[PDB]
């Protein structure tokens, strides 16, 4: 019937298996938001040096992770799940973790 932070692992797996063309549209900015929350939730604060700007994807990822600094694991888990629920509802789709 409804979800919580405890649905994080299922949400991550849902995101990772979204096809490139499908009823769910996942834009590049949303990909980075999910990435950053994933990393915060599973590793805590960003580490390592800011990547070279030429490595455009790696740099973007790290910068998104850095934007989450200080967030507790459980809060990042909650945020990731709430963002998927928002994405799905906005596009008229129901999630059933099962």
Q: Give 22's DSSP letter.
A: S
Nearest CA among 50, 42, 95, 91 for reference residue 71: 42
The alpha carbon of 65 is separated from its chain's Cα centroid by a whole number of angstroms, namely 10
Resolution for this PDB entry, in angstroms: 1.5
Q: Are the beta carbons of 95 and 13 closer than 8 angstroms?
A: no
φ, ψ (nearest 5 deg) of residue 57: -65, -50
- Name 30's Cβ contacts closer than 8 Å, sequence gap at least 6: 83, 87
Experimental method: X-ray
Q: Spell out the domains of the chain, with CATH numbers in brackets.
A: 1-98 (1.20.80.10)
45: helix, strand or coil: coil
35: helix, strand or coil: helix
């Amino acid at each position: 019937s409804h979800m919580s932070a405890a649905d994080f692992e299922a949400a991550v797996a849902y995101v990772r298996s979204l096809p490139k063309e499908g009823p769910v549209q996942l834009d590049n900015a949303a990909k980075l938001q999910f990435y950053s929350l994933y990393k915060q939730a599973t590793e805590g604060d960003v580490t390592g040096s800011q990547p070279w700007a030429v490595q455009v994807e790696a740099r973007a990822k790290w910068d998104a992770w850095n934007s989450c600094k200080g967030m507790k694991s459980e809060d990042a888990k909650a945020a990731y799940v709430r963002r998927l629920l928002t994405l799905l509802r906005s596009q008229g789709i129901q999630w059933k973790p099962g």
